[PDB]
UniProtKB/Swiss-Prot annotation, chains A, B:
The gene is FHIT. It is linked to A chromosomal aberration involving FHIT has been found in a lymphoblastoid cell line established from a family with renal cell carcinoma and thyroid carcinoma. Translocation t(3;8)(p14.2;q24.1) with RNF139. Although the 3p14.2 breakpoint has been shown to interrupt FHIT in its 5-prime non-coding region, it is unlikely that FHIT is causally related to renal or other malignancies. Associated with digestive tract cancers. Numerous tumor types are found to have aberrant forms of FHIT protein due to deletions in a coding region of chromosome 3p14.2 including the fragile site locus FRA3B. Substrate binds at residues 7, 26, 82, 88-91, 97. Its EC number is 3.6.1.29, 3.9.1.-, 3.6.2.1, 2.7.7.51. This is Bis(5'-adenosyl)-triphosphatase. Pfam families: HIT. It comes from the Eukaryota. Possesses dinucleoside triphosphate hydrolase activity. Cleaves P(1)-P(3)-bis(5'-adenosyl) triphosphate (Ap3A) to yield AMP and ADP. Can also hydrolyze P(1)-P(4)-bis(5'-adenosyl) tetraphosphate (Ap4A), but has extremely low activity with ATP. Exhibits adenylylsulfatase activity, hydrolyzing adenosine 5'-phosphosulfate to yield AMP and sulfate. Exhibits adenosine 5'-monophosphoramidase activity, hydrolyzing purine nucleotide phosphoramidates with a single phosphate group such as adenosine 5'monophosphoramidate (AMP-NH2) to yield AMP and NH2.
Length: 124, 124
C-alpha cells in the first residue's frame, strides 16, 4: 500500500512510516542493512519535493540510519541519493540509500519481512 | 569565518549561507560543479544534528543542487554524505557532496572565488 515508482510495496517489508516518508528493506541489499527511505508521494526528482517533505525525508533518514548502524553492527554510514537518469536513478522515485559501514567491507519476501520486523522494534 | 572541521573557510569561496547551513566550492571537484553543503555547527556524525539543522541542511541541499545542475549544464544530480570513518569521511564534519550529472561522464583560490561569485547570482 506504498508506492515506489510503478510498484506497490507490501507493508510487510516496510519498517517505519511517518506523515510524509517511509522506509523499507531491499530485495538485494548491497551490504547487510542497506535499506531505503522514500517520500510517500511519488516524485521522480528530488527538486519536486516540497520543503516539508524534504525536512521529513531526511529527519527520517537520520533516524533510520542510527538504527541499522546499531542493528547491523556498523561503525559508519554511507548515505546517497541518485537523482536523475544520468545519476543512475533506476526507479523514478526519490529514495535515499542508507548503508551501514564496517572496517574493510537476493532473498525471499519472508526474509525481508523478518528483517523489517526486527527493525520495527527499534522504533517502538 | 566558516568552520569545516579544523579549517577556516574564507567567505570568498562560500556561495550560500542560511540560518543553519552553508555551501561552498571545492579545491578539487570530482566533476565541474561538485560542491558541498555543511551545517554551520561542526558536528562529526550526521546523528549529532538537531532535527532543525537536518531540515535546514537538506532544504539547502535541495536548492544548491537545482542551481549547479543549471549552471554546469547537468541533467541529473548525485547526492551523498560519507558519515563516519568507515564510510570514507576524511573531514570530521557533516557535509553533503552535490555533483551535477551528464550523459557519459585542482585550482587557485581565485578560480574558486570566481566560481562562488557566479553561483551567488542564482540565489540573489
Ligand atoms: N564502495 C562502495 N560500493 C557500493 N556502494 C558504496 C560504496 N561506497 C559507498 N557506497 C554507497 O552505496 C550507495 C550506492 O548505491 P546505488 O545508488 O548504486 C543503488 P541504485 O540501485 O542505483 O538506486 P536507485 O535507483 S536510486 O534506487 C532504487 C533502489 O530501490 C531498490 N528497490 C527498487 N524496487 C524495489 C522493490 N520492489 N523492493 C525492494 N527494493 C526495491 C533497489 O534495489 C535499489 O537499491 C551510495 O549511497 C554510496 O554512498
Ligand atoms: N562514478 C562515480 N565516481 C565518483 N563519484 C560518484 C560516482 N557516481 C556517483 N558519485 C558521487 O560522488 C560522491 C562521492 O564523493 P566522495 O564521498 O568520495 C568525496 P570525500 O572526499 O570522501 O568526502 P568527505 O570526506 S565526506 O568530505 C570532504 C569534502 O570536502 C572537501 N574539502 C575539504 N576541505 C576543504 C577545503 N579546505 N576547501 C574546499 N574543499 C574542502 C573535499 O575536497 C571533499 O570533497 C557521492 O556523493 C556519489 O553519489
Amino acid at each position: 500500500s506504498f508506492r515506489f515508482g510503478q510498484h506497490l510495496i507490501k507493508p510487510s517489508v516496510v519498517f517505519l512510516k511517518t506523515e510524509l516518508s517511509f522506509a523499507l528493506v531491499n530485495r538485494k541489499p548491497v551490504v547487510p542493512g542497506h535499506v531505503l527511505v522514500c517520500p510517500l508521494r511519488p516524485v521522480e526528482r528530488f527538486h519536486d519535493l516540497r520543503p516539508d517533505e524534504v525536512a521529513d525525508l531526511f529527519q527520517t533518514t537520520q533516524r533510520v540510519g542510527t538504527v541499522v548502524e546499531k542493528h547491523f553492527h556498523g561503525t559508519s554510514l554511507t548515505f546517497s541519493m541518485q537523482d536523475g537518469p544520468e545519476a543512475g536513478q533506476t526507479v523514478k522515485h526519490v529514495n535515499v540509500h542508507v548503508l551501514p559501514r564496517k572496517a574493510g567491507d537476493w532473498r525471499s519476501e519472508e526474509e525481508m519481512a523478518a528483517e523489517a520486523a526486527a527493525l520495527r522494534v527499534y522504533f517502538q
